[PDB]
Amino acid sequence: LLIDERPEEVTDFRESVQGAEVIASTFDEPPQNHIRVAEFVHERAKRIVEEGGHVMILLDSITRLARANNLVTPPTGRTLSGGLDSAALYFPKRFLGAARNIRGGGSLTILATALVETGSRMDDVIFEEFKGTGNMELHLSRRLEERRIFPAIDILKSGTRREELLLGEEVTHKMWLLRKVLADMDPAEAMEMLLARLARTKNNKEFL
Amino acid sequence: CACGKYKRQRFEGKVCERCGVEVTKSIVRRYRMGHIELATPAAHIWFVKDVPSKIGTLLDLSATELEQVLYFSKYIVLDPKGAILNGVPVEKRQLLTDEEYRELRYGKQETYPLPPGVDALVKDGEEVVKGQELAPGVVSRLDGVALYRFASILVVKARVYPFEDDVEVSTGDRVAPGDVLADGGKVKSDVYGRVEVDLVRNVVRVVESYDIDARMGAEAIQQLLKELDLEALEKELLEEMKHPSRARRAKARKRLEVVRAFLDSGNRPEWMILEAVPVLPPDLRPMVQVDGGRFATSDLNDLYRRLINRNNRLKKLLAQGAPEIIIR
Amino acid sequence: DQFRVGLARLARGVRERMLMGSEDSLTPAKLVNSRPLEAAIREFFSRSQ
Amino acid sequence: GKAQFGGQRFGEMEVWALEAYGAAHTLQEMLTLKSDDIEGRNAAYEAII
RNA sequence: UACCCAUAACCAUAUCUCCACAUCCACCU
Ligand code: BEF
């Protein structure tokens, strides 16, 4: 799902996605259309997972999605510092927390892009609010990106919850040791050295 | 700093973003100081080797041999208890060798292996004198009690006491005469010593070793300096100086001046010996490359390195296990 | 004199080398090493008073 | 040395003679301003410039 | 609360590198 982006990128991804369902909503369109399409995608995906479906949702600009929502969001009720509705995020919050794992088959995995360090209170506030809602975080630093190094992941801040649940005891314990080792290593230099180290073998092969 | 985010003159004082270093020159390494926490106390060499031994005069200790031998070699000093008798009267601060000391520490003990499957003529609680024929071929050495096992003999210069009721003193406690040992007032202690109760023959054996101070080296000195009070010593030196003639009063005043100096100057002599050793700032002992990567170093660096190695070896050794001779 | 001091050092060295040596066909190599005597002579000719 | 000559020893006999006169600030400048006080010598050089 | 009400973030201050020590030979008292 794509919101508030440039149409040329829409064309590029759509042709280059190799048939995967790409839904787009440019900044050209009225934001009411953006909300309409986003929520229709939401309800359709909810139905599909309700049918035990495994659904992957790739959301564009989740914090800038919050900004677009605020564009759609006039009243703010009591003016929060920044100007967002009391019930605004509850639509994004439902949309996000709906992504979950069930024992009854199927799944809903939603990964979204967050725009942060944007110099304004709204984006930082949304970053904090949805920071405590997601089960995994991936920070991408400006300094890493400016050096044209991608993926420019802020490794230290990035992480998940409940590794043992998703990762076996051998796996979870061995990356327990692995984090105990790599937590000291400096970010960019970690990039080069671990890049060289893992260019030798596949991840499992590296563990092998 | 290590990273350099918050460094600039608008915001040098604001704590660094990726760092925590306040802006400063290398002069900090000229003045900032280190320290080493020794696991074992040690004494400043000056106070123990100066011609007037400050330790040797503050305490009634001979500088040339006593101070060093207790402070380096395995010798024991002890304040509290010395009333145990070895053909020699009570002890208060006397210096005794660790051989005879270790002896008096745990009684007067001798052990003799016995052949298995041979029931020696000596029973569990038999008093034995020198010359008594313990077996077709075995003879003891001194008056005491011989303990029998199936297969060993234990000759202890201790006193055994049969009893048939409950125990008042359990195994481990060291007792003074008149104190109830077992069976209430029926059995009471006769001498200083430790109590061991064996219910196999239902008997209390009392050794003649009372709980006495055992110390070596600097810690001992510290203990002494911890238990020393300056004012009483000052008064005592006053009386011991005013009354007698000139010869004794000479040394009396020679130590009284030191005691008065300690008392009136503040700093108490407990920290006269040092527990944590300071470490000079690096720039006062810098390792500077000469040529070809080789580094010329001040010998201070080597001395600190040796001290660190010894201290870490001590820490490891004391952590793992205690072979006594190796520990000393 | 410096030569004979170095020579005695080499003699002690070869004594030890024989001591842990097992077989006998080792006369040139496993017996004599030039380091002690050469170092002694060099030290005498360089750093002596 | 190799780079620059180095200063001159001012020892103690010279110090004794300097204080034998009534010279008070001369010795003070020559012990701190011209010899050891790093901040002092930098400030003095800047001021005289 | 929204008009008042709500603000805190980004850049420019410098005497040093080695020369240590040992041995030896000289010069001036
Ligand atoms: F919002 Be937190 F994760 F409790």
DSSP conformational letter for C7: H
Distance A124 CA to E2 C1' (A): 22
CB of B270 closer than 8 Å to CB of B47? no
CB neighbour class for A12 (10 Å; exposed up to 12, middle 13-18, buried from 19) = exposed
CA dist A138 and A160 (Å) reads 9
Inter-axis angle of helices A121-131 and A62-72, to 10 degrees?
120
Separation of CA A78 and ligand 1 centre (Å):
24
- Taking alpha carbons only, the member of A121, A119, A127 closest to residue A81 is A121
Q: Helix, strand, or coil here: B162? A: strand
Distance A91 CA to E3 C1' (A): 30
Dihedral sign computed on CA atoms, order B251, B253, B259, B262: negative
Token representation of residue B115: 């052949």
Separation of CA A132 and ligand 1 centre (Å):
4
The residue whose CA lies nearest the C1' of nucleotide E17 is: D3
∠ CA B141-B147-B150, rounded to 5°: 120
Separation of CA A121 and ligand 1 centre (Å):
20
CA dist A187 and B212 (Å) reads 61
Dihedral sign computed on CA atoms, order C45, D2, D5, D7: negative
The residue whose CA lies nearest the C1' of nucleotide E20 is: B296
CA dist A138 and A91 (Å) reads 23
CA dist B307 and B71 (Å) reads 18
Residue A28: Cβ within 10 Å count: 10
CA dist B283 and B297 (Å) reads 11
Give the residue ranges of DSSP H helices in chain B. Answer: 27-31, 45-49, 54-58, 68-71, 98-105, 217-227, 230-242, 246-264, 299-320, 324-327
Q: Helix, strand, or coil here: D14? A: helix
The residue whose CA lies nearest the C1' of nucleotide E12 is: B9
H or E element at residue B40: strand B34-43
Whether the link from the prior residue into A151 is cis, omega within 30° of 0, is yes
Contacting chains of D (3 CB pairs or more, <8 Å) are: none
- Cα-Cα end-to-end distance for chain D: 26
The residue whose CA lies nearest the C1' of nucleotide E24 is: C49
Residue B298: Cβ within 10 Å count: 15
CA dist D8 and D16 (Å) reads 16
∠ CA A13-A18-A19, rounded to 5°: 100
Q: What is the 3-state secondary structure (H, E, C) of C14-28?
A: HHHHHHHCCCCCCCC
∠ CA B178-B191-B134, rounded to 5°: 130
The DSSP string of B198-257 is ETTTTEEEE-S--------HHHHHHHHHHH--HHHHHHHHHHHHHSS-HHHHHHHHHHHH
The residue whose CA lies nearest the C1' of nucleotide E19 is: D1
Task: Give the number of C-alpha atoms closer than 13 A to the C-alpha of residue B67, restricted to the C-beta side.
Answer: 24
Separation of CA A190 and ligand 1 centre (Å):
29
DSSP conformational letter for B23: P
∠ CA B21-B27-B29, rounded to 5°: 75
Token representation of residue B326: 């190796």
Token representation of residue C2: 């410096």
- Cα-Cα end-to-end distance for chain A: 37
> Cα B283 from chain centroid?
38
Q: Helix, strand, or coil here: B177? A: coil
Give the residue ranges of DSSP H helices in A61-200. Answer: 62-72, 90-97, 121-131, 142-146, 163-166, 169-182, 187-199
Contacting chains of B (3 CB pairs or more, <8 Å) are: none
B153 φ, ψ to 5°?
-125, 140
Residue B100: Cβ within 10 Å count: 12
For residue D38, give the amino acid letter. Answer: I
Distance B13 CA to E11 C1' (A): 15
Token representation of residue B59: 């305490």
Q: Helix, strand, or coil here: B25? A: coil
Residues sharing a CB contact under 8 Å with residue B31, sequence separation 6 or more, in sequence order = B281
Distance A84 CA to E4 C1' (A): 21
Distance C11 CA to E25 C1' (A): 37
Dihedral sign computed on CA atoms, order A57, A60, A61, A67: negative
- Taking alpha carbons only, the member of B211, B128, B195, B121 closest to residue B161 is B195
CB of A5 closer than 8 Å to CB of A61? yes
Sheet with B174-175, edge to edge strand ranges = B159-162, B203-206, B193-198, B174-175
Distance A137 CA to E7 C1' (A): 30
For residue B16, give the amino acid letter. Answer: C
CB of A128 closer than 8 Å to CB of A84? no
Please tell me whether B132 is known to bind a ligand. Answer: no
How far CA B181 is from CA of B55, B83, B170, B241, D17, in Å, comes to 43, 20, 8, 48, 85
